[PDB]
Structures are given as C-alpha cells and as structure tokens.
Amino acid sequence: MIKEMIEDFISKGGLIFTHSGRYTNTNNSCFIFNKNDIGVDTKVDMYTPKSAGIKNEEGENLWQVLNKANMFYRIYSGELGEELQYLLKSCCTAKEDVTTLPQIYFKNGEGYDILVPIGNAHNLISGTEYLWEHKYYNTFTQKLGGSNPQNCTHACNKMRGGFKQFNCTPPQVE
Amino acid sequence: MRKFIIVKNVKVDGINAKSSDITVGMPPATTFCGLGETMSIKTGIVVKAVSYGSVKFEVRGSRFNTKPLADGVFTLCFEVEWEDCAEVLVDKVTNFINTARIAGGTIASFNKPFVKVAKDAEELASVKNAMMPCYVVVDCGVEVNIFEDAVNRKLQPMVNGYKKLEKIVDNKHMRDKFTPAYLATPTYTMIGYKMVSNVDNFDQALWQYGENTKVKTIGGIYND
C-alpha cells in the first residue's frame, strides 16, 4: 500500500523536509528536517526531480497521501511499525545549501550570529488550508515554483492555486 | 529612559514588503531594530531601543492595478545614550539616515531629527506624543498560534526573530567565516497598532533585541 509509494520515492532522489530555502529561490537546494517540529498535524513537504512519485489508484502521489489523514505522524511514530517506518525517516535528511539565500546578522549578547533564513513547509501547506477553511481573506496569495512549479517541490507542484500570506499593511494617518 | 532622538516623516521608496513566506506588508520590528543597530555600529552612538510608527504605507498594486514592493512614510524614535552635545547628535543621525535603507528601500526625505528627554514616567509621555501622528507597533503576544490568533483575535502576525535550525558546516559561500552561522527560520508574535498618543506606557512600544534570537519591547506585552 504505502510501501510502493515510499519505495518509488526512495528510488528517485526523494527528500522529506520541514524547512527549505527553495520557497525563496527555485535554484536553492537547502532542505532541513526539524525533528522536534513533528506532531499529529505537522504538514511536510518533499522533493524529487520533476516532482515524480507514483500515483496510487485513489488518485494520489506520496505527498498527497502522507498529508491526508495525519498519515505522516502515524507512520513516523509507529502505529505503522518498523518497515513502514525507518525508511520513511531514511529520506527525512538534511541538505545544506546557502546559495542565493540571504545572510543577516542578528545581535546575540555582546556579539552577533549570522542567520541564513529558510521557510517552513507546514506554515505554507497547513497555513493555506487553515485560512481557506476559516474564510480568512485579509491576505495576499503567492504562487511559488515559477512557471514550472513541478520542479520546485511537491507542494508547489500540487498547490498551483498558490499559498496565502498575511496582509500586514498598517493603518495610515489620514 | 532618558534620551530619545525622533525622525518624523521618513519617506521610503521600494520597500521589500516580504518579510517571510507568509507576511507581506509592514516591515517587522526586527527590521527597525536592525536599523537602529546598524546606526549604532556606524555612528558609534549607543542605541537602546526604537519605537516606529506608520504614517503612510501601500503595497504596490494593492490600491490600484499598475519581489512584492511597497512604499510608505514612517516616524522613528531611537532611545539613545549621549551627552556630548545636542545637535552633534542630530547631525550624526541626519548623516546616517540620508544613506540608510529600510527593508531594502531608499530613504527619500525626512524631517529634521530632534532630541527629547525624559526624567520620569510623566516626561516619557511627552517623548511619546512628539511622534504624533503615527500608528506604532505594540506586542500583543501569541495566545494559541499566529493562524488561530489571526482569525480569532483579529490581530496581525509579525516576524519577531528566528529559530536556529542547524549550524552551517562548510562556510564556503558565507560572507563571514568567523561569526557563528546558522540555518534559521523566522518566529512570530502578534502585534497591534496604536495611535502613539493612545499608548499608555511608552516602554511597551520601544523595541530592542532580546534573548534567544528575538526582539521584544522594554515594557512587555501591551496592556490598556
């Protein structure tokens, strides 16, 4: 069932991540998986070249399946058991890439850190679903991945309608 | 809480309105904290905190049909430590603003900087009102999360810092190979806007860096 999905995913160079710099630049290949971030409703994103992934008859590819019925937590925790685990976590692996990303200094005591900001898959995927369900429209919509999102991430490849952003316009002195 | 320099009507063109993947509009308090911190570095002046307010602001294309760029006008107020003079401060600040940037956009003009002083809480309200008119940013905290809070409290999310995710291993492309570098992702708080004069305690509008890679106000979460 799920195995052939993951099987075919590991076949291609498949990565599961919670954070990525792709969201800010389609050529960046930074992918990070924050293990503490994972919970019952944690939405995740994935990458294969050309966003492949076999399409189980139900019509769904692995990204769709993993994010439907909290299927990622279930599998990642163990109500699935060894087999449909550890090789799910075989792809939850990092990939450092700084190119095209910003570098900022952020004060820290006497001294500074330098931070390379990358974006969060859950806030994009789950965020957009949540503002959709609750009829919240004080937003901008942003389509990611360029024309050709299928080569950016799996969520970009399927959420072609775009991701919701908070409209942070302030009030004006009239 | 003694000395403050105020710069009214800083007009800024071509602001990069995108402060995170999910926030487009007003530049977050990190940005203005970074402005003051940058001023401190270049001018040698000690900057304690910064209050900033909105006067005008518009994301391009959001009022009329014509990466997300904006333009607006802000009023700034820096809490400062300085006793060498009064206009030698005003000149060092003028000199820095003329070429500073705010979220990537260029300053086009500003009123002349001026200095205000507070000896107690009551004079502090005079510093506050000298910013009028503008809508300053105050910290309302997160109750549940920014999504639920945005729907239910009808408040506005704002980048307030970063969570370090991993240390960067090979500094090949890093600008600076000595400062500790981290892959990081923004953290948020919820903010509200107040016509400055309506702010009870000015400490609650004065933003500065804090522990664990966040900014916050001197006086904490805003309360009426």
Side-chain angles (χ1 to χ4, degrees), chain B residues 11-54:
Chain B
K11 185 205 173 65
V12 191
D13 306 324
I15 296 159
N16 176 18
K18 182 160 159 156
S19 52
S20 84
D21 296 335
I22 55 173
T23 52
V24 170
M26 188 76 177
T30 51
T31 293
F32 295 89
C33 285
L35 172 59
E37 180 73 353
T38 290
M39 184 172 80
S40 193
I41 279 161
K42 312 278 216 63
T43 76
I45 304 171
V46 152
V47 185
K48 302 299 279 174
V50 54
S51 187
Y52 61 105
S54 170

Side-chain angles (χ1 to χ4, degrees), chain B residues 98-118:
Chain B
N98 281 332
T99 58
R101 298 225 227 281
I102 297 172
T106 73
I107 285 83
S109 68
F110 45 98
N111 294 29
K112 183 165 190 55
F114 64 97
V115 179
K116 274 262 131 166
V117 151

Side-chain angles (χ1 to χ4, degrees), chain A residues 19 34 96 103 105-107 112-119 123 127 130 140 165-166 168-173, chain B residues 21-22 24 26 37 54-57 135 147-148 150 156 164 168-169 174-176 179-182 184-185 193:
Chain A
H19 298 73
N34 195 246
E96 198 178 280
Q103 300 180 18
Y105 289 107
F106 203 105
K107 185 148 202 153
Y112 299 79
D113 291 301
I114 182 92
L115 309 178
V116 174
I118 57 174
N123 281 3
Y130 181 90
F140 300 116
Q165 317 161 291
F166 293 98
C168 298
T169 304
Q172 301 196 86
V173 168
Chain B
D21 296 335
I22 55 173
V24 170
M26 188 76 177
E37 180 73 353
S54 170
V55 182
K56 309 252 138 198
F57 194 93
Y135 290 96
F147 292 101
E148 259 209 51
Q156 189 174 103
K164 305 162 172 177
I168 288 176
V169 153
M174 302 294 317
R175 65 197 279 149
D176 169 350
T179 306
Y182 302 88
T185 185
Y193 298 93

